[PDB]
Design a protein around this ligand. Structure first.
Ligand SMILES: C[As](C)(=O)[O-]
Ligand code: NA
Lengths: 249, 249
């Protein structure tokens, strides 16, 4: 039946430790597309609402790539074969770049993380994202990914977790669940354009990691850039490996 | 996609606190069948290997009943519309009977449970089911459901949990996981005919519950008979409601 079919699909991804894939495969958020629901040899774990991720596994297949078209999406190939089809089909219509996966067995230095939180200057107020702050994070574009992948505020409060810094009554930095899975969250951090250079996103992240641990959740980091990897390293994460990714040109 | 369709199917079952339905919808064990992949209005949560449950949700649909035919199965209708279809289609070919659901918010008296375990006479030996006892349970029809729903010993040891009472070197009673879900198990208790009426079921049930609680698992009880309900009440469970069930005659 349907459940057996999904078990087969999960095998196409195998041991691919990207928590967003786990989200899609677990069933509550994200979605899964295949070449043939009856005899699946190709799969896509598609996740997001404004920004997206498309993890492509199994046999390279053109139709799954078409699903990803027209979206503010990061395509992640399982292997060179997927990358080859992506380049073959879209050529200049796609932009190759490199992301950095971190190990999922992180040992965190709590004193260090609490220190980062504690060092925050006097006028900056750290808060957990609640019902009202959820909506606040949706107001400006810079902060939307902190909560925008959740269907509504209720799904965020139920399944998400985040924390924001306020300064003079405005949210100016945040760290929150870009996605959630059964045992953790995938972290997103953001700082407003006019509040750079103050270590705000590091402080938020420190706080979110502590809140995750306090709740027995694993806080996952997957870096979009080297600068992002450098910050993860300061938080206690270690690089797993650099990996191929693509975006539409 | 596939995960969205599975979310739609799950809604058909709604708030139905039977853990085997949870097993089937979580994705690891059991399976799910529907009238229409794209427009699901009727669904079947089917679980088992030697004995089975068929939980039927949504609009009554005769094709889902057909999937249950020729199996050692308990059919559980979500509603009276399903019951009416079952009776109409099969007439004297189904036996109608009442099972008793228990509340899932049980407060167990650990002291009481341990006393029941302690009261097992020295003549009897209580043991957790291991690789060898797994095989012993499968050999007799009376004990096979203690472990038989798992694909093999490896799956049973990984996801299941159970214990047995031995006397003169033979397994004479046992309490084990008929099924498992993310946060618990569904209990199966059995006693060999010649050893009934000696309080053995109560002792192994008490031990299993204690084993569950110790591991943070919820030990669920769904009573096949009033006698089973009365046992559950001694163990701390409280009746939720009597409900309709069918078997093939
Ligand atoms: C063996 As029973 C606890 O399902 O009546
Ligand atoms: Na699941």
């Amino acid at each position: 039946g349907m459940a057996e079919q999904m078990r087969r699909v999960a095998r196409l991804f195998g041991d691919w430790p990207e928590t967003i894939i786990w989200t899609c495969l677990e069933g509550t958020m994200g979605d899964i597309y295949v070449d043939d629901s009856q005899s699946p040899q190709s799969a896509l774990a598609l996740y997001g609402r404004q920004s997206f991720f498309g993890f492509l596994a199994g046999q390279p297949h053109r139709d799954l790539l078409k699903i990803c078209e027209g979206k503010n999406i990061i395509l992640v190939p399982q292997n060179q074969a997927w990358s080859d089809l992506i380049e073959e089909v879209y050529g200049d219509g796609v932009r190759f770049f490199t992301r950095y996966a971190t190990k999922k067995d992180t040992e965190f230095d709590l004193g260090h993380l609490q220190k980062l939180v504690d060092d925050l200057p006097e006028s900056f107020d750290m808060k957990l994202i609640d019902r009202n702050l959820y909506e606040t994070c949706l107001v400006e574009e810079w902060s939307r990914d902190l909560v925008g992948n959740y269907i509504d505020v209720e799904q965020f409060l139920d399944l998400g977790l985040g924390c924001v810094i306020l300064h003079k009554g405005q949210v100016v930095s945040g760290a929150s669940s870009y996605a959630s899975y059964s045992a953790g969250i995938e972290i997103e951090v953001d700082t407003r354009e006019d509040y750079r250079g103050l270590g705000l996103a590091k402080a938020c992240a420190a706080q979110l990691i502590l809140a995750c641990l306090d709740r027995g959740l694993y806080p996952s980091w997957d870096a979009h850039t080297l600068t992002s990897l450098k910050l993860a390293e300061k938080l206690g994460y270690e690089l797993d490996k650099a990996y191929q990714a693509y975006e539409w040109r």
